[PDB]
Design a protein around this nucleic acid. Structure first.
Ligand SMILES: [K+]
Ligand SMILES: [K+]
Ligand SMILES: [K+]
Ligand SMILES: [K+]
Ligand SMILES: [K+]
Ligand SMILES: [K+]
Ligand SMILES: [K+]
Ligand SMILES: [K+]
Ligand SMILES: [K+]
Ligand SMILES: [K+]
Ligand SMILES: [K+]
Ligand SMILES: [Mg+2]
Ligand SMILES: [Mg+2]
Ligand SMILES: [Mg+2]
Ligand SMILES: [Mg+2]
Ligand SMILES: [Mg+2]
Ligand SMILES: [Mg+2]
Ligand SMILES: [Mg+2]
Ligand SMILES: [Mg+2]
Ligand SMILES: [Mg+2]
Ligand SMILES: [Mg+2]
Ligand SMILES: [Mg+2]
Ligand SMILES: [Mg+2]
Ligand SMILES: [Mg+2]
Ligand SMILES: [Mg+2]
Ligand SMILES: [Mg+2]
Ligand SMILES: [Mg+2]
Ligand SMILES: [Mg+2]
Ligand SMILES: [Mg+2]
Ligand SMILES: [Mg+2]
Ligand SMILES: [Mg+2]
Ligand SMILES: [Mg+2]
Ligand SMILES: [Mg+2]
Ligand SMILES: [Mg+2]
Ligand SMILES: [Mg+2]
Lengths: 101, 271, 88, 64, 55, 117
RNA sequence: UGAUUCAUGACUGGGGUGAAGUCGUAACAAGGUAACCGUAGGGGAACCUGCGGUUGGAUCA
RNA sequence: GUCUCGUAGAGGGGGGUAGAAUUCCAGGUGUAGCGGUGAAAUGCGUAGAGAUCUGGAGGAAUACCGGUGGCGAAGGCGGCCCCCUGGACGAAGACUGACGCUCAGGUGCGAAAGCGUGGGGAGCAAACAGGAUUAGAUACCCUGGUAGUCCACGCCGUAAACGAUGUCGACUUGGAGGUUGUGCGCGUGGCUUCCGGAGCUAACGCGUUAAGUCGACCGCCUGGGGAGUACGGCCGCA
RNA sequence: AAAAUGGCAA
């Protein structure tokens, strides 16, 4: 498996769905024998610049170790989910468990 | 695959064939076949109403499912088949309940692939959904113009439509012509492009190959006498008039669209 | 490049010991393993000329090692090419 | 170079407070010569800032 | 270069701050650089010449 | 003739000309003046003085609206960048903000070829 | 019936030489639009223009 | 030369994505100019331009970072993310045991322009048109503008494709830097910039990255024109 | 802004 750091931002009106979204995403990874090394919910934050005419978004950070295939499936889910305005998936050299800044 | 013939005869020199190894070599599925006798371009008054049609090979009609309304039931592609009635290839699909149907074969579709139709279908080539449920910017084909009517747009080999926008009960589509058109969001579309995009690379190579497809020769108006055609006449090659149809309408730029009823749906003409 | 586990397996199969990574047979077996693996890459990426230059170096290096082995010991050479399914 | 003194392995795109020091008011990345940042960290800093810009943690420009 | 005139600040002082901010941003230099296309060969030649002169 | 307390002055400072347009905060134009239209043609048109006069003429053009406070947006590298702003202050408008809005591509499109003179 | 070699042939291509001819002034200075290389298009002519490349470019107060 | 661990990198191929800007389209505000030059004019604008604001479309390129910086055999390679993948370097050991160097012919790669088929087309722009300038102006300057520039695939095979310096190895005073490892402020490796000693060189200069001192192998030269042309051959769609 | 040209001799 490989270590990926995933940051996704959700439309503020769909902030209520975020806890359910997180559980489903974590479930997919754990189902594939992946491990959730870090999970943080930053909550609604002020965007540096407007995205899709939105001035705020709900940020979620997760560090995960998983097969590349499950991560690809997660990226497709983000693409087809209207709530997820933006997402970033980055490979990491090692698992990160320390709290984010 | 596109294959140039070797020039072993003058009629073969320019021939370019599109050869698909995947296409079924056997006979079509008999329950979905109907006869379709030829018209010669003649109507029920027995008059030629479209010129240049006649002869060509005998062809059986394959009943193709343009509606794709068997929702919720997965189907597996058994085989791709040649269809003489259209430029696209067709796929024989088997539903889990044991029903077989033909569909337009999308690009990339192969035997063993699984397809589904309905609101809950996955966004994958060959799947059919209401365009309300299809993401904006998607490439689609076999697009209905009225909900439940059956696909009418983007059915020819290699064609597709783009869903450019969604507003209320209507989606805006970019057609192959380049026209921007509004259609009801409830109208169904199939994900992907129609397959057989190499269709347009074929080169018939000889007069006889057009005859096989039931195309009779076009005689140029200027080669006729005045009594036959506006362009007719002259001692030698002469012209000296604005180009027109055999019936006298200008045929180089004059627009003929006249449908106030459907004008509301046209966002932008092809230009 | 070849994984640590994949490399380690090959060394064991062709080497006298796990320490014997330097043997011609091991070297050729490692080269063959990567060449065969890269065939998939180059089928997908026909215009990856820069990577292919690396492949060609592997092919050349393998050829030189086989030529060395053949003159050094024909019997070892004959066994190796049979095991690796090499024409020569 | 703060990063060299700190002994940070990699500059973090999430660490906006640090990053804000190395961007101008316009939002442009500050040159290493002015900051005194080592080249290796300057490259890491640029990548981090670009990632932060994409996530809208930092502005590309002062007038979005 | 966005300058907000502070309370009890003279216009001239604020204007000088705007000029300074523009110079820091190097807005005018960027505009002059982009007025016409410089071939990469020309760009590389200029950069080398600057480095040699500085040395 | 709706009264607008707060307006935005847009200064288009080009090498050939200066255009001064005073708008409401929403960006609806209220009045405008140019160096070219202010009685300066040819070499005079591209001067700070001509830009100054344009600013004054624009201020006169928007006098009915009774604008008190102006936010200034400056665009372009032309000679009328600063003279216009000083003129607006001299006109008696309170300048709340001064901003440079000159467009800069982050690469963008290939510019025209270099002139050979 | 071919090959090859030599001679010759209306006319035609470019080359060289020769008056202080005719038309310009392309290059050498920043040669007055730096020059040149490859390529492409154009033009009575030297050449001009695009694209990329080189310094075997002058200037810097 | 192989293995183990790690490091830096615009190395390559594929896919996705972001922000800035230009153009276009639609609409709002607004009114007589705009644009352009040495100066003009062509052009655009009362059929409402330019300016300003909002929404949309589309293509191409990635400001700042940025560097006598880095990577690549050369050509070349620059937003960010993922996938596949080549090379280099360092440390401490282990392993193989001369397995090496060069290379006619051969084969592969090879900027830009160009060619073929199918796409795409914002900006730019050969050709072309008009306006200037001029004795003329088939130009330089201006307003426009098509191929092309972009993508896929195939062809072409050339450039001042340059360090005008073939590849590999050994040896021979220094100084100041850059960049990238590593051991314990002092060492020790890789790559790179400037300067300079002996020596070398017609001189200019080169100078441990040699154009010094040697060895291996290859390519090439033999006065200027005529000519890298003719003819023939081979290659190419041209 | 424009700004062309000038036999070979010794
Ligand atoms: K999404
Ligand atoms: K005909
Ligand atoms: K006729
Ligand atoms: K006739
Ligand atoms: K006749
Ligand atoms: K003859
Ligand atoms: K010239
Ligand atoms: K040229
Ligand atoms: K050899
Ligand atoms: K064009
Ligand atoms: K050689
Ligand atoms: Mg017909
Ligand atoms: Mg058919
Ligand atoms: Mg038919
Ligand atoms: Mg015809
Ligand atoms: Mg007749
Ligand atoms: Mg008639
Ligand atoms: Mg006649
Ligand atoms: Mg006539
Ligand atoms: Mg001259
Ligand atoms: Mg000249
Ligand atoms: Mg010159
Ligand atoms: Mg020209
Ligand atoms: Mg790599
Ligand atoms: Mg290098
Ligand atoms: Mg090209
Ligand atoms: Mg082409
Ligand atoms: Mg143009
Ligand atoms: Mg032009
Ligand atoms: Mg050559
Ligand atoms: Mg080069
Ligand atoms: Mg050479
Ligand atoms: Mg060699
Ligand atoms: Mg020296
Ligand atoms: Mg020749």
């Amino acid at each position: 498996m490989r270590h990926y750091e995933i940051v996704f931002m959700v439309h503020p009106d769909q902030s209520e769905q975020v806890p359910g979204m997180i559980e489903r995403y974590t479930a997919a990874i754990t189902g594939a024998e992946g491990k959730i090394h870090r999970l943080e919910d930053w909550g609604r934050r002020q965007l540096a610049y407007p995205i899709n005419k939105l001035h705020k978004a709900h940020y979620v950070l997760m560090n995960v170790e998983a097969p590349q295939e499950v991560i690809d499936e997660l990226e497709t889910t983000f693409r087809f989910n209207d709530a997820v305005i933006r997402s970033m998936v980055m490979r990491t050299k090692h698992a990160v468990t320390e709290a984010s800044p | 695959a596109v294959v140039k013939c070797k020039p072993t005869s003058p009629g073969r020199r320019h021939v370019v064939k599109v050869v698909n190894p995947e296409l079924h070599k056997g006979k079509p599925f008999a329950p979905l076949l109907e006869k379709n006798s030829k018209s010669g371009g003649r109507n029920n008054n027995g008059r030629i109403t479209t010129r240049h049609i006649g002869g060509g090979h005998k062809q059986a009609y394959r009943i193709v499912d343009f509606k794709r309304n068997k929702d919720g039931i997965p189907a597996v592609v058994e085989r791709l088949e040649y269809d003489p009635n259209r430029s696209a290839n067709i796929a024989l699909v088997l539903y889990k309940d044991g029903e077989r149907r033909y569909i337009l074969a999308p690009k990339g579709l192969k035997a063993g692939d699984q397809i589904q139709s309905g609101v809950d279908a996955a966004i994958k080539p060959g799947n059919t959904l209401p365009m309300r449920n299809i993401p904006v910017g998607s490439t689609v084909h076999n697009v209905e113009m009225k909900p439940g009517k059956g696909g009418q747009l983007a059915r020819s080999a290699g064609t597709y439509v783009q869903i450019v926008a969604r507003d209320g009960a209507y989606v805006t589509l970019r057609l192959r012509s380049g026209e921007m058109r509004k259609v009801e969001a409830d109208c169904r579309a199939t994900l992907g492009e129609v397959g057989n995009a190499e269709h347009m690379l074929r080169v018939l190579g000889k007069a006889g190959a057009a005859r096989w497809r039931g195309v009779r020769p076009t005689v140029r108006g200027t080669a006729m006498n005045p009594v036959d055609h506006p362009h007719g006449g002259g001692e030698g090659r002469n012209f000296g008039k604005h180009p027109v149809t055999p019936w006298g309408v200008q045929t180089k730029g004059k627009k003929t669209r006249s449908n106030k009823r459907t004008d509301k749906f046209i966002v932008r003409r092809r230009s | 490049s070849l994984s640590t586990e994949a490399t380690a397996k090959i060394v064991s199969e062709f080497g006298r010991d796990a320490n014997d990574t330097g043997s011609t047979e091991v070297q050729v077996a490692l080269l063959t393993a990567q060449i065969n693996h890269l065939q998939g890459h180059f089928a997908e990426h026909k215009k990856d000329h820069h990577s292919r230059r690396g492949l060609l170096r592997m092919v050349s290096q393998r050829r030189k090692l086989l030529d060395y082995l053949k003159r050094k010991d024909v019997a070892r050479y004959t066994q190796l090419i049979e095991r690796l399914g090499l024409r020569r | 170079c703060r990063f060299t003194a700190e002994g940070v392995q990699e500059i973090d795109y999430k660490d906006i407070a640090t990053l804000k020091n190395y961007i101008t008011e316009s939002g442009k990345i500050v040159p290493s010569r002015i900051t005194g940042t080592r080249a290796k960290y300057q490259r890491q800093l640029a990548r981090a800032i670009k990632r932060a810009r994409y996530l809208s943690l930092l502005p590309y420009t002062d007038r979005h | 270069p966005v300058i907000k005139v502070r309370e009890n600040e003279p216009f001239d002082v604020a204007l000088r701050r705007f000029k300074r901010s523009c110079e820091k941003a190097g807005v005018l230099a960027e505009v002059r650089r982009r007025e016409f296309y410089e071939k990469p060969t020309t760009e590389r030649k200029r950069a080398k010449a600057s480095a040699v002169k500085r040395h | 003739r709706k009264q607008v307390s707060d307006g935005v002055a847009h200064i288009h400072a080009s090498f050939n000309n200066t255009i001064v347009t005073i708008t409401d905060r929403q960006g609806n134009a209220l009045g405008w003046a140019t160096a070219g239209g202010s009685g300066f043609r040819g070499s005079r048109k591209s001067t700070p003085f001509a830009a100054q006069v344009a600013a004054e003429r624009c201020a006169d053009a928007v006098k009915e609206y009774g604008i008190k406070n102006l936010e200034v947006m400056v665009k372009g590298p032309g000679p009328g960048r600063e003279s216009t702003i000083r003129a607006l202050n001299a006109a008696g408008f309170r300048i709340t903000n001064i901003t440079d809005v000159t467009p800069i591509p982050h690469x963008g499109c290939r510019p025209p070829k270099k002139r050979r003179v």
